[PDB]
Structures are given as C-alpha cells and as structure tokens.
Design a binder for this molecule. Structure first.
Ligand SMILES: O=P(O)(O)OC[C@@H]1CC[C@@H](O)O1
Ligand SMILES: [Mn+2]
Ligand SMILES: [Mn+2]
Ligand SMILES: [Mn+2]
Length: 391
C-alpha cells in the first residue's frame, strides 16, 4: 500500500460555486464558500489556504499560495440529485440516477392515504417543521386521538411523531417500517424515515432518545463494502454510518458537533488502523446552510480551520488526508434546499516533500472512491478515475 491510512473529511454542503448543470436545479448564481467569504468581509481560513484552497478558487480572504501543502482541484457531481446520500454514495464509487425528493409543501395525498390504509391510523400535520414547533401545535391532538403526526424538514426526510403512552413504541416502529417501504417509490423517494416518539403533557412535550432512523442502503456495493470485505478498517465518524446504512462500516463514532467531529478524527489519528477513517462535518449543512445563516456558517468554517494544524502535526508519512464536500448549500440562496455546486478537493500527505500541484478537474465524485480502492488494492468501482498516481 502507498498509504496505510486515509483520512477522508466531508465538509458537508461546503460548495465552491455553481456546477455546469446548476440551471436545471434553479441554482444559477450559487456559491457557498464565495458568498460566505463576502458576508464575512474575508473568511479567515489560513490552514485550508496553506493546503491550496485559494489555488482552486480565489475568494474574499482566501488567496492562492506559491507552494500548496498538497494537491488541489474541484469535483463535478455526475449523479442526478444534489442530496447528502447521492453525494456520499457517488464519493464511494456509485452513480445514482434517481434523486431523493424534498417536500417543502408536505407529502402527496396518495402517499399519506396509503400509509393510513395500511396502518388503520389517521395522519395529521404534513408540513416542514422542527420537532419542538410541531409538538407544540399538534401534540395534544395526537394524544387525544391516537393520530400520527407526520412532518418533514429541509432535508429528504419523513418524520413520524407519537406520544409513547398513547402509541406503543413498538407500534410506532412498525408504522415507520411500512412508511419506509412505501417511500421506495420515485414519486416520493425520501432519504430517511424517522420515528419521533415523545413524552410529557401539553405545553411540555419532549422527544425521547427512542428516536429510530430508517435509511436506504446505497444503490450498489461501495468501496467501503470492498474495504470491509478485504479486512480493512472502515471507521465512520458522525453521520457517515447512517448515510451508508452501516454498509462497509467496521466501527462507528457518533458526534454531537463539528468540534466533537474533529476530536474523533484526532482519536482515529491516535489509533493503529489500516484502511479508511471517514468523517462527516454536518453542522455546516444542518445549522447554517438550510437556515440561510451566512454569519453562523462563516464562524463554523473558521472554527474548523483552526483545528487543522493539530491534524497536520499528527499525519504520518504513510497517511493521506482528503478534504471535500458532498454538494453546496448556499446560505444566501432562495428557498431552503441544497445548491448544485462543484466541491473542493484537497489531498495532502506529509510525504509530499515538495508540496502539491493542480489535479485535472474530477468528472465524478467517484474519483475519490477509485483512489481509495486503488490505494488498498481492492476491486475498483464501476465509476471514477483514481488520482493516486498523480499524488
Ligand atoms: O426535527 P428537528 O429537531 O428540528 O431536526 C431537523 C432535521 C430533521 C431530521 C434531521 O434532518 O434533522
Ligand atoms: Mn436553488
Ligand atoms: Mn450533505
Ligand atoms: Mn442538507
């Protein structure tokens, strides 16, 4: 093996400007990092800059450097959708024709009718909302009628809330599994179905840790599957295991924040493994992009950048660090959906003694999966061109 360990970091939703097919998605003008940089009157990301971020694209506060620490380029998405699952599945070697859907106006009547018909239960709500807001509004009605609160959010999700003392937890899970089956349908293909049990009394409802997520398996065996099948370590950090429904994962480390994510990354640097450590930093997407909060997004990017020198210090000669994103989510864009953007790619190993150079633009996110597969000598994905030899 060229590299004993590969550290792959997805900065979730951190796009680097509209992709050539942005118009199809209503995403003309989108630019996640660029608009944030402008809002911040110059982004302070000196460590990403040292890696070559400004060499990919110069933006306010983000300038090119003569000798980038590693190699740099951007990647174009080939799959139809701009959702988290599509982006991650593509990164790990797949091509996804069928997009997952988002539902800003709630779910189609046909889906909800069928869910009632299979469960013998009434459905109420049917709109985007946070868990606190929807429970405040409908929690009492739910308790009194035994109905099911169905709701969505900014992402591709179908959420079902029921009081634990009115709808037995085990029944709520059965209902969610039925909904998971009904949503395997391109007319209304949702990324995940989520059980949202809650307890308490009107004016004091709280969601319990009995939450359960029902994910789809990737539409293909991924590079992660191949690594796991060859007895390599595949350490998933943050939402990674959920995103892939555990496929190809040997260890999973839950995180509660971006900084906790960087702490777990550090934990894996301190582990003797051979294979892949795969981190998703989700705050960018969940707290800032969808909420259209460029200030919060800018601050999070700066907090993340400040953590990188410790990572640089810990990387061994036979370690490779890969930093990318899975789509854009421009916090100064109309609506609440993701944005169809190129994503940055930075590839750094301390063994790169004379620094990096520009890579040819990656025609699919699957170039990452191809590179990882080639490094570890496992079956090459059907899509993607390795850049291993360029490093
Ligand atoms: O319902 P919450 O707590 O406001 O969470 C928002 C989204 C819904 C599911 C996950 O994407 O997080
Ligand atoms: Mn748009
Ligand atoms: Mn994402
Ligand atoms: Mn999202």
């Amino acid at each position: 093996n060229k590299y004993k360990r590969i550290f792959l970091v997805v900065m979730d939703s951190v796009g680097i400007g509209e992709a050539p097919d942005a118009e199809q998605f209503g995403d003309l003008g989108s630019d996640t990092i660029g608009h944030i940089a402008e809002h911040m009157n110059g982004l302070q990301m000196p460590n990403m800059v040292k890696l070559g971020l400004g060499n990919i694209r110069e933006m306010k506060g983000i300038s090119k450097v003569e000798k980038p620490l590693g190699y740099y380029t951007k990647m174009q998405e080939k799959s139809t959708g701009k959702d988290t699952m599509t982006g991650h599945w593509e990164i790990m070697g797949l091509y996804i024709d069928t997009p997952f859907q988002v539902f800003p106006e709630g779910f189609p009547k046909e889906l909800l009718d069928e869910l009632e018909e299979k469960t013998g239960r009434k459905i109420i709500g049917n709109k985007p909302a946070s868990g606190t807001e929807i429970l405040d509004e409908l929690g009492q009605e739910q308790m009194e009628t035994g109905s099911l609160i169905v709701y969505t959010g900014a992402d591709s999700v179908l959420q079902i809330a029921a009081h634990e003392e009115v709808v037995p937890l085990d029944e709520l899970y059965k209902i969610c599994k039925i909904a998971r089956e009904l949503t395997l349908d391109e007319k209304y293909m949702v990324g995940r179905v989520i059980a949202r049990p809650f307890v308490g009394e009107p004016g004091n409802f709280t969601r319990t840790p009995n939450r359960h997520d029902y994910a789809l398996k990737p539409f293909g065996r991924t590079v992660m599957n191949e690594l796991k099948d060859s007895d390599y370590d595949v350490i998933a950090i943050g939402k990674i295991s959920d995103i892939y429904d555990g496929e190809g994962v040997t260890e999973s480390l839950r995180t509660k924040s971006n900084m906790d994510g960087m702490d777990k990354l550090v934990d894996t640097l301190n582990m003797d493994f051979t294979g892949l450590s795969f981190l998703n930093l989700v705050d960018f997407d969940a707290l800032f992009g969808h909420r259209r909060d460029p200030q919060g997004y800018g601050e999070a990017l700066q907090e993340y950048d400040a953590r990188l020198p410790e990572v640089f210090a810990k990387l061994k000669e036979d370690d490779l660090l890969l930093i990318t994103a899975d789509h854009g989510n421009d916090p100064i864009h109309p609506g609440t959906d993701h944005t169809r953007e190129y994503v940055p790619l930075l590839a750094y190993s301390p063994s790169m003694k004379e620094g990096g150079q520009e890579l040819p633009l990656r025609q699919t996110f699957a170039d990452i999966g191809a590179t990882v597969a080639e490094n570890f000598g496992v079956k090459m994905p059907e899509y993607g061109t390795s850049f291993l030899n360029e490093l």
